[PDB]
Amino acid sequence: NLAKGKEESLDSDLYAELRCMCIKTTSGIHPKNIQSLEVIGKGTHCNQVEVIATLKDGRKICLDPDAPRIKKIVQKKLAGD
Template identity: 60%
Template structure:
């Protein structure tokens, strides 16, 4: 019986905290919205042939993910996660950056 009496105030406090967080979130107009708070790349490739790549997106570490992510969009529309530390991937990024700066 004593445990139930102790648990009820804790539950009430948790419910109140949740309501306050929801109310505060609704008032935060103009705050940036983050779609996902996790890494996109769970597995990475060591490299891929440059002729198969349409574009490359490099996402630095941040609140969504603690590691740099390199996502290549292939010419067939698929996306591939590349290991940013792999020598081949570093070459691909450099070639893509140089290709963009010459145009």
């Protein structure tokens, strides 16, 4: 949909999340599949921290910042001695 006629799609129902990049998140991802990830802090129209992971095969998914499982996965990725 090209022109000035939005709101008929999956775009956010929440004013505070109008500019968030993620619609939802993916579970069951393994640290080994992750090539890199970006942690984005809260912004003007996105009151949620977002975690966008790029998998080794190029797939991009969002991860739940609050999932103890995800916090562990990020910790795992950070380690590498």
